[PDB]
């Protein structure tokens, strides 16, 4: 999770999808999770401005 | 060594079958038990039917047996509630109960709301003590005349509605039987191929305009 939130910061969101697959499960098990991590990442890219 | 003309054939006696052989010499005074302990059953349950809690109107599935009707497991929980009988009171007066069954058509749902009134009416119900009855409990004349039932209760027989001999109109005779089976086969299979090319041909008119 920490490591996949370091390819999402720097926008390599394919390699990151292709990295989460091996760990957690199938292509749709690595989809919502890649959609969850992006949204907490996007959280702390708000709470810094405020 | 096969002689000559003569069918090839594969036996499964290569195991030690003899050590597991089953015989039915029992067969005659195994029947005469069932029938005895059968005969015990309903002397224990006196004026209650030996035919037991009543089985619903239920089909047989798939395209082979889908013309038929048979007895089932139990009445669905939207056939009991509409009629006016509860699920834990229905067990206590010969009406079947099953938590799984479905209601997908209304042609086998109206047939099972009427089934439970037929029954509710023709039942005979005894008082709690012989010396003090109440309200829904039946009179002491039926109960005199009332008695046990034999064989399935209101048994479902095979049914079909008749039809007359008819003068055919001039558009029945002008209807193809084989060429209407072949133009419904053609449009079911090819509709996937149809819709993507009415899309790809209408895709190119949008591009060359803009």
């Amino acid at each position: 999770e920490r490591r996949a939130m370091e390819l999402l910061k720097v926008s390599k969101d394919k390699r990151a999808l292709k990295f989460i697959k091996k760990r957690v499960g199938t292509h749709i098990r690595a989809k919502r999770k890649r959609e969850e991590l992006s949204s907490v990442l996007a959280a702390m890219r708000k709470a810094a401005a405020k | 060594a096969p002689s000559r003309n003569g069918m090839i054939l594969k036996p499964h006696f290569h195991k030690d079958w003899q050590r597991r052989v089953a015989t039915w010499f029992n067969q005659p005074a195994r029947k005469i038990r069932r029938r005895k302990a059968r005969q015990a059953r309903a002397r224990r349950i006196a004026p209650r039917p030996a035919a037991g809690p009543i089985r619903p109107i239920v089909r047989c599935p798939t395209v082979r047996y889908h013309t038929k009707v048979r007895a089932g497991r139990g009445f669905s929980l939207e056939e009991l509630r509409v009629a006016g009988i509860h699920k834990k009171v229905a067990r206590t007066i010969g009406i079947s109960v099953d938590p799984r069954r479905r209601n997908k058509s209304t042609e086998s749902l109206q047939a099972n709301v009427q089934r439970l009134k037929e029954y509710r009416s023709k039942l005979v119900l005894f008082p709690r003590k012989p010396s003090a009855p109440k309200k829904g409990d039946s009179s002491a004349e039926e109960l005199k005349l009332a008695t046990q039932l034999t064989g399935p209760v209101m048994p479902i027989r095979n049914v079909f509605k008749k039809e007359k001999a008819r003068v055919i109109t001039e558009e029945e005779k002008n209807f193809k039987a084989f060429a209407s089976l072949r133009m419904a086969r053609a449009n079911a299979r090819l509709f996937g191929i149809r819709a993507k090319r009415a899309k790809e041909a209408a895709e190119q008119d949008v591009e060359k305009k803009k």
Binding site: - | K15, W17, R20, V21, A22, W24, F25, Q27
Partner: protein, 203 residues
């Protein structure tokens, strides 16, 4: 109230916290004996799912199991026979390193009855399990209607005959198309139906 958060935090082992706790505690089971009693249950949440209550009767032992596989027993390594059956080093056990826990609690404590088990630590040679058991003569258990299903002479040594939920899984049963080799009671009796001749009288 508090048992909603105790479940969800044990489901976070790869965090910082639970990584530390499943480490200190596991050092501290390589130190004590290979079967030993435990004063109160460690995961009181997870236990209370698999049946436990707190009342003068129940009890927990905490057994440890050597980890790994099976190696086929013959002198030096010389299985005399055909080539298929030269196999000794990559074969496996059909039941589990759970149920081997439920059983060794079972044999030692022969008065008591097994009920269920659950996970608690692992190392690289050891897996550690806790293991519920019940005194079937304590008047508390004899006289709660609910419990008395266990006191009865048939439930003797459940662990030994594939009956506990950790037990059941090897015998290969469920419902449907995926489990065809059991229809009948159990694996053995599928086989038997398929191999009789059914010799009636007239034939």
């Amino acid at each position: 109230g508090a048992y909603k958060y105790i479940q969800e935090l044990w489901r976070k082992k790869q965090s910082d916290v639970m990584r530390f706790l499943l480490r200190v505690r596991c050092w501290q089971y390589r130190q004590l004996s290979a079967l030993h009693r435990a004063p109160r249950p460690t995961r009181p949440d997870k236990a209370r799912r698999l049946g436990y209550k707190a009342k003068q009767g129940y009890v927990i032992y905490r057994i440890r199991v050597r980890r790994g596989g099976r190696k086929r027993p013959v002198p030096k390594g010389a299985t005399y026979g055909k080539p298929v059956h030269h196999g000794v080093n990559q074969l496996k056990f059909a039941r589990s390193l759970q149920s081997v826990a439920e059983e060794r609690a079972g044999r030692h404590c022969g008065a008591l009855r097994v009920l269920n088990s659950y996970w608690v630590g692992e190392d690289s040679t050891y897996k550690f399990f806790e293991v519920i058991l019940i005194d079937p003569f304590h008047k508390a258990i004899r006289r709660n209607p609910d419990t008395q299903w266990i006191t009865k002479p048939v439930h003797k040594h459940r662990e030994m005959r594939g009956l506990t939920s950790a037990g059941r899984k090897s015998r290969g049963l469920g419902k449907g198309h995926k489990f065809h080799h059991t229809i009948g009671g159990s694996r053995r009796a599928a086989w038997r139906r398929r191999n009789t001749l059914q010799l009636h009288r007239y034939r």
